[PDB]
Amino acid sequence: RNLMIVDGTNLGFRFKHNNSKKPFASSYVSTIQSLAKSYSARTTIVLGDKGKSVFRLEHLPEYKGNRDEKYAQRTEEEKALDEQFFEYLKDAFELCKTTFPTFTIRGVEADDMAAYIVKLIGHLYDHVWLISTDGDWDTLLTDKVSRFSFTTRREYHLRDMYEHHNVDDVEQFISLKAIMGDLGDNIRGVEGIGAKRGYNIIREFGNVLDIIDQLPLPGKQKYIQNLNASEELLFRNLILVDLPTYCVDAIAAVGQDVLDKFTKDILEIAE
Ligand SMILES: [Mn+2]
Ligand SMILES: [Mn+2]
């Protein structure tokens, strides 16, 4: 049998997208029941996000701050919509507490937990299926851990790292994130180097850190010039995007005690 780890909030937003007026708690869980049934799940795990990350915020105070800007400018009607959704998200998360183990730790994101769970009990299953539409989860991809999105109805394995992410492996995808930037999570990257232009430098010189050693890099191009004068930036970005390496840390940030309760809480279900 397999293990399934869903992206509680990500799915919520999907339901919201489809319709931001109708309650979706009921179908929400049913969707996680069919899926679990389908992926021969043995342990279904539901994880939702709650508050900004404590780990990231430290290495970057303005982390996801753009998302706060957006709420600030929302109209009285849209703000209401946002609150409506979240309410429905909470309810969708409460109903879940009746069928699937649901976790939430204020200060810790979801990708930080799912990486821990996988790192923690992954070996106890044949496969591991993560339910999300967030390609950032693809940093956990292996030949025994993949992801499935509804927004496309596509599954994602490792061999597909080039078509879906313009890189060859997890370490690469990371470095590309720490180099190119993540407009979403509000993270500044080298001015001038995107996916295609960034992968090249990664294919030639290596990964972020391997590249740090090598600076200054040759070439007279500005994005190259900019690159050479943005080392400090790569260090910070690498710790914000390298999910599989800093997750434990990201959890211990909100408490060496919380991390413990979560650890025992997982194995309890895994066993
Ligand atoms: Mn997330
Ligand atoms: Mn992103």
Side-chain angles (χ1 to χ4, degrees), residues 182 186 218:
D182 180 358
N186 184 59

Side-chain angles (χ1 to χ4, degrees), residues 4 93 95 143 153 231:
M4 181 177 293
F93 276 133
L95 198 72
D143 58 302
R153 298 183 172 173
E231 177 190 0

